[PDB]
Amino acid sequence: NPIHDRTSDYHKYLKVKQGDSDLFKLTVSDKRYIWYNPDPKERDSYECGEIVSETSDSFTFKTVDGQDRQVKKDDANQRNPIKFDGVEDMSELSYLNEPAVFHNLRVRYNQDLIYTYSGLFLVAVNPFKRIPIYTQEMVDIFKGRRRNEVAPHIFAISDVAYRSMLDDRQNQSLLITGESGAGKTENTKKVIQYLASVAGGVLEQQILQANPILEAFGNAKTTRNNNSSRFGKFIEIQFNSAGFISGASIQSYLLEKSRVVFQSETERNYHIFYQLLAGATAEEKKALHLAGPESFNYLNQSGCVDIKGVSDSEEFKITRQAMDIVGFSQEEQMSIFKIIAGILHLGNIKFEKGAGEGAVLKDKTALNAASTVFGVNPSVLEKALMEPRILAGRDLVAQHLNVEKSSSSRDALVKALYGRLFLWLVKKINNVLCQERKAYFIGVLDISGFEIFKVNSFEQLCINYTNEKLQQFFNHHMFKLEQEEYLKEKINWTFIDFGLDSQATIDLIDGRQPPGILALLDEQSVFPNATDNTLITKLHSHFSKKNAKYEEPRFSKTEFGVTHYAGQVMYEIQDWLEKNKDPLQQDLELCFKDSSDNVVTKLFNDPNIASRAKKGANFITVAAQYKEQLASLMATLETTNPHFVRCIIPNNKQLPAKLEDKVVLDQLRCNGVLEGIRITRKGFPNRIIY
Ligand SMILES: Cc1ccc2c(c1)C(=O)[C@@]1(O)CCN(c3ccccc3)C1=N2
Ligand SMILES: [Mg+2]
């Protein structure tokens, strides 16, 4: 049994290594220690001092510099006896405080033990390096083993959820939290690998091949993650009454399609673009009129076209192979790349001013190239771009857009093409994975993590609000409902205020009465004369000096701050109305509806992809679509028994072996980890009726 064999990889990679006789001597010591702040200004930088004396209400200890300080016992962060250093479940620590919890994670992290239990939930610190703990041999070890019988691991919590699904005949859910780059997507994959194995000969393989496809079109390099998921997703692993995998369903959420036409410095567009250009055959390059990434406006503005340690040519091959195993016709696959190539050409179209204010198109090389691969008439497309037709009452009037507006319309077409292609890809995949009515399922949530950039827009607000909601879901299940049970069954429990509540922030963003940020956003979206300026003025009017989670900065007139659980974020109001309205000239849709290409035709004719719901007189806004998907997720989660995994980023440099206290402690605090451990200790978790 590898579990009890100190020579097995299991012991080598999942257990804390045996300490020596020298460590043993320190472990049996009678001395007592305390964690203190050498600098009262740097509260997260701790040192270990020895307690030399005490009074009825205080300790006197020695600092590293051989000095002496005193502290009241009530404010003291005592250090746990070192026999606890490396403990697998921190609910066991005698002293539960920030430096103690951080120290234990540090001790384990220093030995590449990234998983640690914090009572009922799992904590996972991103190693930013490969660790051999995800092999089939590792999967077999955890199979059917109780949590307390094996080391902490993403596989263990997956197995527990699986057993609970069978033991209770209840749908389960794995909620993996974390800011951008913390490890959510990596762990999500592990969960699926493990379940596919223990409950699994072709379906399971296709289920696995679904990710590399989604990531190529849905992931991209941002300043916080080289493989940032730019769309969130809820994955349903479906099982039959017997407990066998009967299928899988992928619920994808809104994609950051604005990235296709713009990327901040040092970031990249979606991976696929680089994979195609770098992995396409010499013939494909001629047929699609491809060239180097530096040749395309949509790829040569960030100053970055490659990711260290990543081969786009090699990744392309993996994507293609994934597309094959899932079942994408060689025809479909080619159309997909034509769309990708077409998008690139569209981005190269340079509009110029004519004799008048209207724009003209002198060079038509790119226009012609795009029309070619897309299978649409270039003259038509050209007219639909610079001279779209609209109704002026009931009259049909041909517009003549200037350079700026022509460019924006061109970007709108691009974003719609990509966003729809993504929906199409997910749809196709679900057809293959969905072929049997399920009896149960385990849902794995992998949303885009909390993120902050120099410039935060509408997308970031929605992303961070999602993270705000998931954290509230954790607070609710861990603290609210927990104590609600105690007081319901009344076991002489006095309510405890854990101080974790994101309701105020949530109300500020999605509140109905009074109306929140999104509500006002939509309101301004229908107001015929509204501008981004009138929008922010409206927001300031409602929340400046009125909502404690809102801030009207004195240093800017185009930004507003929102205090999230993970920190305050300043949002730039530029383009919010257009992003929310998400317009597209009908003449462009008519142009592509007549495309000779099958995939393209499907993207503009398939209602469930091309159609857009109407909020009465206007088309449903993106904020409205957002709210709908969120509500849908929350409702689903309510029909499941949740399991939480808290992913923790070690630093902000994507470097291994570099655990920074400040970075880690802020996450431990806003995640409610210690409070989570305290409720498990002070309360009564498991309880069965008579
Ligand atoms: C349940 C839910 C609801 C809405 C969401 C998400 C998840 C995401 O993570 C998304 O994919 C992540 C990015 N995103 C988004 C981006 C731009 C505009 C609107 C939404 C998302 N919104
Ligand atoms: Mg991710």
| Domains along the chain with CATH numbers | 1-31+80-451+583-612+640-690 (no CATH), 32-79 (2.30.30.360), 452-582+613-639 (1.20.58.530)
Using the mean position of ligand 2's atoms as its centre, give its distance from the Cα of residue 463 in Å. Answer: 12
Residue position matching structure tokens 């959510």: 184
Ligand 1 atom showing the smallest separation from residue 579 Cα: 18
Percent helix, percent strand, percent coil in the chain, to nearest 5: 45, 15, 40
Ligand closest to 221 (CA) is 2
Q: Determine which residue's CA is closest to atom 22 belonging to ligand 1.
A: 254
List all residues 6 or more positions away from 503 whose beta carbon is below 8 Å from its beta carbon. Answer: 472
Residue position matching structure tokens 């004396």: 53
CA-wise closest residue to 600 among 426, 242, 378, 340:
340
Phi first, then psi: give them for residue 118, nearest 5 degrees.
-125, 60
CB of 623 closer than 6 angstroms to any ligand 1 atom: no
Q: Is 309 annotated as a binding residue?
A: no
CB of 591 closer than 6 angstroms to any ligand 1 atom: no
- Residue 19 DSSP one-character state: P
Q: Are 268 and 447 in contact (CB under 8 A)?
A: no
Ligand 1 atom showing the smallest separation from residue 234 Cα: 1
CB of 450 closer than 6 angstroms to any ligand 1 atom: no
The angle subtended at Cα 612 by Cα 614 and Cα 222, nearest 5°, is 120
- Residue 4 DSSP one-character state: G
CA gap 585, 589 in Å, rounded: 7
Tokens coding 593: 């509806």
CA gap 521, 577 in Å, rounded: 7
Q: Determine which residue's CA is closest to atom 15 belonging to ligand 1.
A: 254
CA dihedral 165, 169, 175, 176 (to 10 degrees): 10
The per-residue b/e assignment along 344-363, b for 16 or more CB within 10 angstroms, e otherwise, is: bbbbbbbbeeeeeebbebee
CA gap 551, 559 in Å, rounded: 9
**If DSSP codes are grouped into helix, strand and coil, which group holds residue 606?**
coil
Using the mean position of ligand 2's atoms as its centre, give its distance from the Cα of residue 260 in Å. Answer: 18
CB of 633 closer than 6 angstroms to any ligand 1 atom: yes
Provide the terminal-to-terminal Cα distance of the chain, rounded to the nearest Å. 38
The per-residue b/e assignment along 229-258, b for 16 or more CB within 10 angstroms, e otherwise, is: bbbbbbbbbbbeeeeebbbbbbbbbbbbbb
**If DSSP codes are grouped into helix, strand and coil, which group holds residue 61?**
strand
How many Cα atoms sit within 13 Å of 88 on the Cβ side? 12
CA distances from 101 to 25, 73, 77, 674 (A): 23, 19, 11, 8
The angle subtended at Cα 585 by Cα 580 and Cα 589, nearest 5°, is 110
Using the mean position of ligand 1's atoms as its centre, give its distance from the Cα of residue 294 in Å. Answer: 30
- Residue 74 DSSP one-character state: T
CB of 459 closer than 6 angstroms to any ligand 1 atom: yes
Using the mean position of ligand 1's atoms as its centre, give its distance from the Cα of residue 144 in Å. Answer: 35
Ligand closest to 227 (CA) is 2
The Cβ of residue 305 has, within 10 Å, a number of other Cβ atoms equal to 19
Whether the CA torsion 480, 483, 485, 490 is positive or negative: it is negative
CA-wise closest residue to 663 among 192, 70, 226, 128:
128
CB of 245 closer than 6 angstroms to any ligand 1 atom: no
- Residue 16 DSSP one-character state: P
The per-residue b/e assignment along 380-395, b for 16 or more CB within 10 angstroms, e otherwise, is: bbbebbbbbeeeeeee
CB of 426 closer than 6 angstroms to any ligand 1 atom: no
Cis amide leading into 514 (omega within 30) = yes
Q: Are 163 and 156 in contact (CB under 8 A)?
A: no
The angle subtended at Cα 214 by Cα 212 and Cα 216, nearest 5°, is 65
Q: Is 183 annotated as a binding residue?
A: yes
Query: Could you tell me where the beta strands, DSSP code E, fall in 413-480?
Result: 440-446
Q: Is 379 annotated as a binding residue?
A: no
Q: Determine which residue's CA is closest to atom 9 belonging to ligand 1.
A: 232
CB of 231 closer than 6 angstroms to any ligand 1 atom: yes
Helix H, strand E, coil C: the string for 184-211 is: HHHHHHHHHHHHHHHCCCCHHHHHHHHH
Using the mean position of ligand 1's atoms as its centre, give its distance from the Cα of residue 317 in Å. Answer: 28
CB of 461 closer than 6 angstroms to any ligand 1 atom: no
Using the mean position of ligand 1's atoms as its centre, give its distance from the Cα of residue 607 in Å. Answer: 21
Q: Is 185 annotated as a binding residue?
A: yes
Ligand closest to 183 (CA) is 2
Tokens coding 535: 């929008």
CA gap 139, 150 in Å, rounded: 12
Q: Are 49 and 61 in contact (CB under 8 A)?
A: yes
- Give the distance, in angstroms, between the CA of residue 518 and the centroid of all CA atoms in the same chain: 21
CA gap 323, 334 in Å, rounded: 11
Q: Determine which residue's CA is closest to atom 2 belonging to ligand 1.
A: 630
Q: Is 178 annotated as a binding residue?
A: yes
CB of 232 closer than 6 angstroms to any ligand 1 atom: yes
Element (H, E) at 234: strand 233-239
**If DSSP codes are grouped into helix, strand and coil, which group holds residue 33?**
strand
Beta bridge mates, 569: 562
Rg of the chain in Å (alpha carbons): 28
Ligand closest to 426 (CA) is 1
Ligand 1 atom showing the smallest separation from residue 252 Cα: 11
CA gap 187, 138 in Å, rounded: 15
Tokens coding 596: 């000779």
Pairing mode of beta strands 68-72, 58-62: antiparallel
Using the mean position of ligand 1's atoms as its centre, give its distance from the Cα of residue 33 in Å. Answer: 47
- Give the distance, in angstroms, between the CA of residue 345 and the centroid of all CA atoms in the same chain: 30
Whether the CA torsion 341, 344, 346, 350 is positive or negative: it is negative
Tokens coding 573: 């109001």
CB of 622 closer than 6 angstroms to any ligand 1 atom: yes
- The preferred substitution site among 235, 415, 447, 465 for testing ligand 1, maximizing ligand atoms within 8 Å of CB, is 447
Ligand closest to 232 (CA) is 1
Ligand closest to 184 (CA) is 2
Packing angle between helix 98-109 and helix 673-682, nearest 10 degrees?
110
List all residues 6 or more positions away from 250 whose beta carbon is below 8 Å from its beta carbon. Answer: 210, 214, 233, 234, 235, 236, 426, 429, 430, 433
Q: Determine which residue's CA is closest to atom 1 belonging to ligand 1.
A: 630
Report, as residue numbers or ranges, the catalytic residues: 180-181, 185, 225, 228-229, 449, 451
Tokens coding 278: 């770098």
CB of 462 closer than 6 angstroms to any ligand 1 atom: yes
- Residue 72 DSSP one-character state: E
Packing angle between helix 661-671 and helix 673-682, nearest 10 degrees?
50
Cis amide leading into 293 (omega within 30) = no
Beta bridge mates, 68: 62
- Structure method: X-ray
- Residue 620 DSSP one-character state: P
Using the mean position of ligand 1's atoms as its centre, give its distance from the Cα of residue 611 in Å. Answer: 19
CB of 235 closer than 6 angstroms to any ligand 1 atom: no
Q: Are 86 and 149 in contact (CB under 8 A)?
A: no
Beta bridge mates, 564: 567
CA gap 453, 451 in Å, rounded: 7
Pairing mode of beta strands 440-446, 395-398: unpaired
Q: Are 257 and 419 in contact (CB under 8 A)?
A: yes
- The preferred substitution site among 225, 260, 462, 467 for testing ligand 1, maximizing ligand atoms within 8 Å of CB, is 462
Using the mean position of ligand 1's atoms as its centre, give its distance from the Cα of residue 325 in Å. Answer: 28
Using the mean position of ligand 1's atoms as its centre, give its distance from the Cα of residue 633 in Å. Answer: 11
CA gap 108, 88 in Å, rounded: 9
Written as one letter, the residue type at 360 is V
> What protein residues have CB closer than 5 angstroms to ion ligand 2?
185, 229
Phi first, then psi: give them for residue 486, nearest 5 degrees.
-55, -45
Q: Determine which residue's CA is closest to atom 3 belonging to ligand 1.
A: 630
